[PDB]
Amino acid sequence: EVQLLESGGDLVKPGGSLKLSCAASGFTFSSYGMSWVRQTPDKRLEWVATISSGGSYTYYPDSVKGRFTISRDNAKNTLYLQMSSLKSEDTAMYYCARGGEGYYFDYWGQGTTLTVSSGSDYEFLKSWTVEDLQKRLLALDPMMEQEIEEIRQKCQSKRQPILDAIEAKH
Amino acid sequence: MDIVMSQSPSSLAVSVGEKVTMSCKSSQSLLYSSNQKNYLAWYQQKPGQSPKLLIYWASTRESGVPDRFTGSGSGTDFTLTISSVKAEDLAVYYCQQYYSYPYTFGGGTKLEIKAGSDYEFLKSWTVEDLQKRLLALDPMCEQEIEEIRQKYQSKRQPILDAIEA
Ligand SMILES: [Cl-]
Ligand code: NA
């Protein structure tokens, strides 16, 4: 069947650059205009770029025009998005989608995430020993584990009454 | 001007079986007179899942979309109606125009179930509806976990860069 699979998301500093890829299969990729759509942390959807089927024409909104470049390889069934001069506001989930060019988006990928870091200056850390830096890292691990465990526990609290109701009906 | 898509209500707490009406206004007509088509789509997105095309040409259902969903309207005023909402319809619904670049989305209408004091109401659901609801939690919870991993990746990176230097 039709499949779109994005890759390339990463953590990047403001002003940096990154290139996303989307592997397309299960349809004649070169026949279709293709697009990128992003979803920001507030869950708003924003169209980012469309490329014509042949690759000759591209379209962008003013928010990314001049910084983003959409491209394609019709023999290799791949769509690309090169993002430059990245800003904090570019942090989002980026979806590959079939459509644009006068059509709705009928197939969407799984998304790949771009995180643009804060841009704060951590120069003072250079004055620290490697031992003190490693201890600061080791202290973040249980903090992440605890926040993950808290989500897992909240999830279970939602699952348990449903699991119980399913079993009660057999 | 760009075309602005405005949706309402922004959120709705619903009971299963209730009729739900969701509205979307465009700032410019989306109807092409020459072919009498409205260049308007609706997408459904559950938490932790990709958006899914639901309705297009304002009133055509995508494959697999059940008939309790009806899209209607023309020109600037559009509506998505669920005649009787099921638990598997609990999702965010986005309208979108594909009439003119830049393509633009509305802000979405979020449908969520009303919170109760106990879960005895689940006995009135079918086993299939209970199973769908249970499994809808899996991508939602995983996407929250991944967001935490991404937050700590960002926290770790200045320290990793200092060590590497
Ligand atoms: Cl309910
Ligand atoms: Na059983």
Numbering used by the authors:
A (entry chain H): 1 to 170
B (entry chain L): 0 to 164
What do the authors of the reporting publication say about this deposited model?
APOBEC3B (A3B) is one of seven human APOBEC3 DNA cytosine deaminases that restrict viral infections as part of the overall innate immune response, but it also plays a major role in tumor evolution by mutating genomic DNA. Here, we describe a high-affinity minimal antibody, designated 5G7, obtained via a phage display screening against the C-terminal catalytic domain (ctd) of A3B. Stable binding poses obtained by the simulation were further tested by site-directed mutagenesis and in vitro binding analyses. These studies mapped the epitope for 5G7 to a portion of C-terminal α6 helix of A3Bctd, with Arg374 playing an essential role.
To facilitate structural studies of the 5G7 scFv, we adapted the recently developed “Fv-clasp” strategy, in which the light and heavy chain Fv domains are held together by an antiparallel coiled coil helices (“SARAH” domain for Sav/Rassf/Hpo) with an additional disulfide bond for further stabilization of the heterodimer. The best crystal diffracted to 1.67 Å resolution and the structure was refined to the free R-factor of 23.4%. Unexpectedly, in all cases, the determined crystal structures showed 5G7-clasp without the bound antigen, A3Bctd. In the crystals, the antigen-binding cleft between the light and heavy chains of 5G7-clasp is occupied by the SARAH domain “clasp” helices, allowing for the formation of an array of 5G7-clasp molecules stacked in a head-to-tail fashion to form the crystal lattice. The SARAH domain also forms lateral contacts in the crystal, forming a bundle of four helices to stabilize self-dimerization of 5G7-clasp. There are two 5G7-clasp molecules in the asymmetric unit of the crystal with essentially identical conformations, with a main chain root mean square deviation of 0.4 Å. The protein–protein interface involves many polar contacts and notably a larger number of tyrosine residues from the antibody, primarily forming hydrogen bonds or other polar interactions, but also making some hydrophobic contacts. CDR3 of the light chain (QQYYSYPYT) is positioned at the bottom of the recess and does not make direct contacts with the bound α-helices. However, a pair of stacked tyrosine residues from this loop (bolded above; Tyr100 and Tyr102) flanking Pro101 in the cis peptide bond conformation interact with CDR3 of the heavy chain that features a unique Gly-rich sequence (GGEGYY), which appears to help shape the latter for target binding. Notably, the positioning of A3Bctd α6 helix mimics the crystal packing interaction observed in the 5G7-clasp crystal structure, where two antiparallel “clasp” helices occupy the antigen-binding cleft of the 5G7 antibody.
